[PDB]
C-alpha cells in the first residue's frame, strides 16, 4: 500500500534492530531494501539524513 | 511438518524418569496435560507400567473410549474410500490413520500403517513425508536401528530426487541423531550448515537448536573455525542476544576467560544432564571441554606454574594438579607436572618430530598390510 | 580359509576414562569455590 | 531462402508462458529453491520474455 515514506522508515528501523542484534548481513539487506525504496519517492532532509 | 509425536513428550518423560526430579509435579502436570489433550491412552499405559504410577481408571477409560471411537471411525472412512474412492484418496485415508496411531502412541501399529502407506504411495514428496514420520518416531523412541535405516532411506530418496526443504529437514534429523550417538563432529557440521535456515520447528524451537549448535560446535571445532563460524556467526549472535548464558559460555571460552568458563561449563553440565538427547553425554562432554580449556591455556606457554593455572581457572591447586595428572596419564594433554616446585612444563612435539611419529605409525599400518598380502599371495 | 576350531569358541568408541566414578563437575567446582 | 537450398524454415517464437515455465524449471534444476516458490508465477510475471 501507500506511504512509502513510512515503509522506508520501517525498513530503516528493521535494519537498525538487526545491527543492534549483530545480524549484520540482515541489517545490510534491510538497509539496501530501504535505500531502494527511498530512491523512488521524496526523501525529506530528516529521512535522507537518517538513511545516510 | 507436524509435531507427531511432540518430542517435548519424550523430553518430559525422560526428565521425569530421573532421581531427585521424580514427582516435582510440574513435569507431571505438563505431561498429563499433553496426554489428556492428545488422548494418548496407550502411551499413558506404557508410562504407568514404566514408572509404577497410580492409574486413574476414571480418566483412563475416557481416553480409551475416545481412542477406540477415533480408530473405528478412521477405519470406516478408509473402508468407504476403498469401496468408492480411488487410490489417490485411499492413500490419504491410510496416511491419516497412521498419523492418528502415532498421535495416540501405538508404535508398532503406526509403523505397520506407515510401511503400507509407503508401499502404496508413488508420489516422491509423500514418500519423503512418510520417511520423515518414520525418522521422527525413531528419534522419539530412540531405536537406533530404525533411525539409521530410515536415514538411509531418506538419503536414497533425496538422491533419487528431492528438494532443498526436505534436504534441510533431513540435515537437522541427521544432526540430532549424531548428537544422540555422540558424533559431535558431524553434528557440528550439520547444525552449522542448517543454522541459517532452521525450519524444523517440530523437533525444537530455534533457541534450543542454537544452544545445541553452540555446544556441539564448541566441543567439535578448533579455535579458528569456531571464531569464523560461531563467534562471527550472524544468526547465532542474533539468538545469543536472547540467550545470555550460552553467550557467556561461548565467549568465556573464546576470550580465554577461564574461571567464567568453568562456571558456564558447570551450568551447561547441569542443563545437559537434564536434557534428554544429550543425557548420556554430559560426563564425556564436560571432560572433553575441560581438556579443551587446559590445552588452550597451555597452547601459549612453555612452563606454566600451577598457582597461575589455578588462579586462572578459579580453582585450587590440588584440583588442577589432579585434573592435569589424570588427563596427562590418559594422554590428552602435552604437559608434564613437577610437584616439588609446582610447575607445568609443556612438552609439545616439534613439527618434524610429530611428522616422524606419524610416518612411523602410518608406515607400520601399511607395512602390516603389505606383509599380510605378500604372505597370502606368495603361497 | 583355515579355522582354528582346535581352540573352542552403545554404538560408540567408548574410552577408559569414561568409566571413572566421581562427583558431578558442578559439585566438584562448587566445593572448590566454596573452600577457596 | 529458395526451397531445395533451405528446404525447411523453423521459427522460434518467444516462449508462450508454458515454454517459459519449462525454461524456468530447466535453468532452476541446479538450484536450491525454497518451498512455496512458484515458477508459474514467475513465468506469468515474464510476458514476451525469451529463453
Swiss-Prot record, chain A:
Tissue distribution of the protein: Highly expressed in embryonic stem cells (ESCs). Expression decreases as ESCs differentiate.
What residue ranges are annotated as transmembrane? Answer: none
Please name every pair of cysteines joined by a disulfide bond in this record. none
Localization per record: Nucleus; Cytoplasm, Cytosol
PTM text = Phosphorylated by AMPK.
Q: What induces it?
A: By FOXO4; expression in embryonic stem cells (ESCs) is mediated by FOXO4.
Would you say which domain of life the source belongs to?
Eukaryota
Question: What task does this protein carry out?
Answer: Component of the 26S proteasome, a multiprotein complex involved in the ATP-dependent degradation of ubiquitinated proteins. This complex plays a key role in the maintenance of protein homeostasis by removing misfolded or damaged proteins, which could impair cellular functions, and by removing proteins whose functions are no longer required. Therefore, the proteasome participates in numerous cellular processes, including cell cycle progression, apoptosis, or DNA damage repair. In the complex, PSMD11 is required for proteasome assembly.
Q: What family does this chain come from, according to its entry? A: Belongs to the proteasome subunit S9 family.
Question: Which proteins does it associate with, and in what oligomeric form?
Answer: Component of the 19S proteasome regulatory particle complex. The 26S proteasome consists of a 20S core particle (CP) and two 19S regulatory subunits (RP). The regulatory particle is made of a lid composed of 9 subunits including PSMD11, a base containing 6 ATPases and few additional components.
Protein's name according to its UniProt entry: 26S proteasome non-ATPase regulatory subunit 11
Which species?
Homo sapiens
From Swiss-Prot, chain B:
**Any one Gene Ontology biological process term?**
proteasome-mediated ubiquitin-dependent protein catabolic process
Q: Which organism is it from?
A: Homo sapiens (Human)
Assembly = Component of the 19S proteasome regulatory particle complex. The 26S proteasome consists of a 20S core particle (CP) and two 19S regulatory subunits (RP). The regulatory particle is made of a lid composed of 9 subunits including PSMD6, a base containing 6 ATPases and few additional components.
**Amino-acid biosynthesis as a keyword?**
no
Please state what the protein is called.
Answer: 26S proteasome non-ATPase regulatory subunit 6
Function of this protein? Component of the 26S proteasome, a multiprotein complex involved in the ATP-dependent degradation of ubiquitinated proteins. This complex plays a key role in the maintenance of protein homeostasis by removing misfolded or damaged proteins, which could impair cellular functions, and by removing proteins whose functions are no longer required. Therefore, the proteasome participates in numerous cellular processes, including cell cycle progression, apoptosis, or DNA damage repair.
Which is a Gene Ontology cellular component entry for this protein?
A: ficolin-1-rich granule lumen
Sorted alphabetically, the keyword list is: Proteasome
Q: InterPro entries, alphabetically?
A: PCI_dom, Rpn7/CSN1, Rpn7_N, RPN7_PSMD6_C, TPR-like_helical_dom_sf, WH_DNA-bd_sf
Q: Report the residue ranges that make up the PCI domain in this protein.
A: 183-351
- Keyword Translocase part of the UniProt annotation: no
* Family membership noted in the UniProt record: Belongs to the proteasome subunit S10 family.
From Swiss-Prot, chain C:
Description of how the protein assembles with itself and partners: Component of the 19S proteasome regulatory particle complex. The 26S proteasome consists of a 20S core particle (CP) and two 19S regulatory subunits (RP). The regulatory particle is made of a lid composed of 9 subunits including SEM1, a base containing 6 ATPases and few additional components. Belongs to the TREX-2 complex (transcription and export complex 2), composed of at least ENY2, GANP, PCID2, SEM1, and either centrin CETN2 or CETN3. Component of the homologous recombination repair (HR) complex composed of ERCC5/XPG, BRCA2, PALB2, DSS1 and RAD51. Interacts with the C-terminal of BRCA2.
Which keywords does this Swiss-Prot/TrEMBL entry list?
Nucleus, Proteasome
Q: Which GO terms describe its cellular component?
A: cytosol; integrator complex; nucleoplasm; proteasome complex; proteasome regulatory particle, lid subcomplex; protein-containing complex
Which lineage do the record's taxonomy fields give for this organism? Eukaryota, Metazoa, Chordata, Craniata, Vertebrata
| Key word Ribosomal protein present | no
The answer to whether UniProt assigns keyword Nucleus to this entry is yes
What fragment of the whole protein does this chain represent? 16 to 63 of 70
As for family, the record states:
Belongs to the DSS1/SEM1 family.
Q: What top-level branch of life does the organism fall under?
A: Eukaryota
Full protein name: 26S proteasome complex subunit SEM1
Which species is listed as the source? Answer: Homo sapiens
A single GO BP term for this record reads: mRNA export from nucleus
**Tissue specificity annotation:** Expressed in limb bud, craniofacial primordia and skin.
Q: List the disulfide bonds.
A: none
Q: Where in the cell is it found?
A: Nucleus
From Swiss-Prot, chain D:
**Cellular location(s):** Cytoplasm; Nucleus
Signal peptide span per the entry?
none
Q: Please indicate which superkingdom the organism of origin belongs to.
A: Eukaryota
Q: Which family does it belong to?
A: Belongs to the AAA ATPase family.
Describe, as the record does, how this protein assembles with itself and its partners: Component of the 19S proteasome regulatory particle complex. The 26S proteasome consists of a 20S core particle (CP) and two 19S regulatory subunits (RP). The regulatory particle is made of a lid composed of 9 subunits, a base containing 6 ATPases including PSMC5 and few additional components. Component of a complex with USP49 and RUVBL1. Interacts with PRPF19. Interacts with TRIM5. Interacts with NDC80. Interacts with PAAF1. Interacts, in vitro, with the thyroid hormone receptor (in a thyroid hormone T3-dependent manner) and with retinoid X receptor (RXR). Interacts with ERCC6.
Q: State the protein's purpose.
A: Component of the 26S proteasome, a multiprotein complex involved in the ATP-dependent degradation of ubiquitinated proteins. This complex plays a key role in the maintenance of protein homeostasis by removing misfolded or damaged proteins, which could impair cellular functions, and by removing proteins whose functions are no longer required. Therefore, the proteasome participates in numerous cellular processes, including cell cycle progression, apoptosis, or DNA damage repair.
Name recorded for this polypeptide: 26S proteasome regulatory subunit 8
- Which classification does the entry list for the species? Eukaryota, Metazoa, Chordata, Craniata, Vertebrata
- What gene is it encoded by? PSMC5
> Which part of the full protein is shown?
306 to 356 of 406
Amino acid at each position: 500500500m501507500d506511504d512509502k515514506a513510512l515503509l522506508v522508515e520501517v525498513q530503516l528501523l528493521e535494519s537498525k534492530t538487526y545491527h543492534a542484534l549483530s545480524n549484520l548481513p540482515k541489517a545490510r539487506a534491510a538497509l539496501t531494501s530501504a535505500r531502494t525504496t527511498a530512491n523512488a519517492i521524496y526523501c525529506p532532509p530528516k529521512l535522507q539524513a537518517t538513511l545516510d | 511438518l507436524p509435531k507427531n509425536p511432540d518430542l517435548r513428550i519424550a523430553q518430559l518423560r525422560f526428565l521425569l524418569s530421573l532421581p531427585e526430579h521424580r514427582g516435582d509435579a510440574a513435569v507431571r502436570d505438563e505431561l498429563m496435560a499433553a496426554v489428556r489433550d492428545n488422548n494418548m491412552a496407550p502411551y499413558y499405559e506404557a508410562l504407568c507400567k514404566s514408572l509404577d504410577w497410580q492409574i486413574d481408571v476414571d480418566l483412563l477409560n475416557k481416553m480409551k473410549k475416545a481412542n477406540e471411537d477415533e480408530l473405528k471411525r478412521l477405519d470406516e472412512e478408509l473402508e468407504d474410500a476403498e469401496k468408492n474412492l480411488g487410490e489417490s484418496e485411499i492413500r490419504d485415508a491410510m496416511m491419516a490413520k497412521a498419523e492418528y496411531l502415532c498421535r495416540i502412541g501405538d508404535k508398532e501399529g503406526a509403523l505397520t500403517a506407515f510401511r503400507k502407506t509407503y508401499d502404496k504411495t508413488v508420489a516422491l514428496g509423500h514418500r519423503l513425508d512418510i520417511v520423515f514420520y518414520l525418522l521422527r518416531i525413531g528419534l522419539f523412541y530412540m531405536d537406533n536401528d530404525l533411525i539409521t535405516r530410515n536415514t538411509e532411506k531418506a538419503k536414497s530418496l533425496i538422491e533419487e530426487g528431492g528438494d532443498w526443504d526436505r534436504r534441510n529437514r533431513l540435515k537437522v534429523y541427521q544432526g540430532l541423531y549424531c548428537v544422540a550417538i555422540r558424533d559431535f563432529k558431524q553434528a557440528a557440521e550439520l547444525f552449522l550448515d542448517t543454522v541459517s535456515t532452521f525450519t524444523s520447528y517440530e523437533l525444537m524451537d530455534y533457541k534450543t537448536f542454537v544452544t545445541y549448535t553452540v555446544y556441539v560446535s564448541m566441543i567439535a571445532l578448533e579455535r579458528p573455525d569456531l571464531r569464523e563460524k560461531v563467534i562471527k556467526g550472524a544468526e547465532i549472535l542474533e539468538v545469543l542476544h536472547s540467550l545470555p548464558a550460552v553467550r557467556q559460555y561461548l565467549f568465556s571460552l573464546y576470550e580465554c576467560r577461564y574461571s567464567v568458563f568453568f562456571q558456564s561449563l558447570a551450568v551447561v553440565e547441569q542443563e545437559m544432564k537434564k536434557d534428554w538427547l544429550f543425557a548420556p553425554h554430559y560426563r564425556y562432554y564436560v571432560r572433553e571441554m575441560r581438556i579443551h580449556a587446559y590445552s588452550q591455556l597451555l597452547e601459549s606457554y612453555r612452563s606454566l606454574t600451577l598457582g597461575y593455572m589455578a588462579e586462572a581457572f578459579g580453582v585450587g591447586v590440588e584440583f588442577i594438579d589432579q585434573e592435569l595428572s589424570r588427563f596427562i596419564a590418559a594422554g590428552r594433554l602435552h604437559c608434564k607436572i613437577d610437584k616439588v616446585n609446582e610447575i607445568v612444563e609443556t612438552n609439545r612435539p616439534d613439527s618434524k618430530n610429530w611428522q616422524y611419529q606419524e610416518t612411523i605409525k602410518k608406515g607400520d599400518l601399511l607395512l602390516n598390510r603389505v606383509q599380510k598380502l605378500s604372505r597370502v599371495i606368495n603361497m | 580359509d583355515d579355522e582354528f576350531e582346535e581352540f573352542p569358541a552403545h554404538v560408540w568408541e567408548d574410552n577408559w576414562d569414561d568409566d571413572n566414578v566421581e562427583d558431578d563437575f558442578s559439585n566438584q567446582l562448587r566445593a572448590e569455590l566454596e573452600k577457596h | 531462402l529458395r526451397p531445395g537450398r533451405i528446404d525447411r524454415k523453423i521459427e522460434f517464437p518467444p516462449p508462450n508462458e508454458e515454454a517459459r515455465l519449462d525454461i524456468l524449471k530447466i535453468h532452476s534444476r541446479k538450484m536450491n529453491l525454497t518451498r512455496g516458490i512458484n515458477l508459474r508465477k514467475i513465468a506469468e510475471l515474464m510476458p514476451g520474455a525469451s529463453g
